[PDB]
């Protein structure tokens, strides 16, 4: 009855040998050398499960010499099978759910969470990365949000081009649209913030921090003054050649023991905060859907703190299903695979295959 990714197949997907893999309930551990394509399997899974990608360019996902790629996820929730497919090519990501052309919205239970070895950049990196964290999560929570955000981004782009091209007389043509969409986006973010703050605070504590982690939003405007602010900062926007009002300008502020984490958190504290953000993402999806997202744990061996590494492995064992990669096998997994040159092959684990041996 839990959801499960029962199989993943790819063809022409960057750094993956074409083929299929069948995954059991519980943890599938995958080990191999740096460069064997482990992260790309997780990326492909995340794409099939959520319709999202880290790639700045879709062509980056397609094997050299090929012009299209294909990913297929088989999902089993109870006795119900579902099929999620993604076709890639020509800058385009085409989804299908159960054989029918689909929008992102027809994808179900907050499909996956992908914990990534670069996640400390959420703490120490630029505002754009924290907007991407929030936008990604909120788009998984709500189809409407994803559509609004997409339309908003394109509309801001037109406004900014009007400014930069010296067509400032024409700059306000879409301000009604930006008001409406910008307000909805800001409000969705405020709604989620209440729970994300609580969830990240708890995860940070459970990870052993004795400092309080708090999330707040740094906002360019408010719903109540958005229209006034938008229009009222014209002189500034003419000077800058850019739009200075709206959620594309905002940030998720991370405060740890009353100081800005970006500037005062140690490297270890930063790793803990970043993991707390992923745990809060997981739990917020779980609370919304009463359905556990598939956990994609990318390079657990890159976590060099024993306790925090063990937390990741325990979390993976705790959920109905996780796919865990690293340079060595995750102990106790339902299935273990070795990654070589983008090909995944089972290996024996005598500790987990001792049933029916007598």
From Swiss-Prot:
Family matches, as Gene3D superfamilies: P-loop containing nucleotide triphosphate hydrolases, RecF/RecN/SMC, N-terminal domain
Phosphoprotein is among the record's keywords: no
Main location: cytoplasm
UniProt keywords, alphabetically: ATP-binding, Cytoplasm, DNA damage, DNA repair, DNA replication, DNA-binding, Nucleotide-binding, SOS response
MF (Gene Ontology): ATP binding; single-stranded DNA binding
Any one biological process term the GO annotation gives: DNA replication
Lineage top rank: taxon: Bacteria
Record-stated family: Belongs to the RecF family.
Protein name as it appears in the record: DNA replication and repair protein RecF
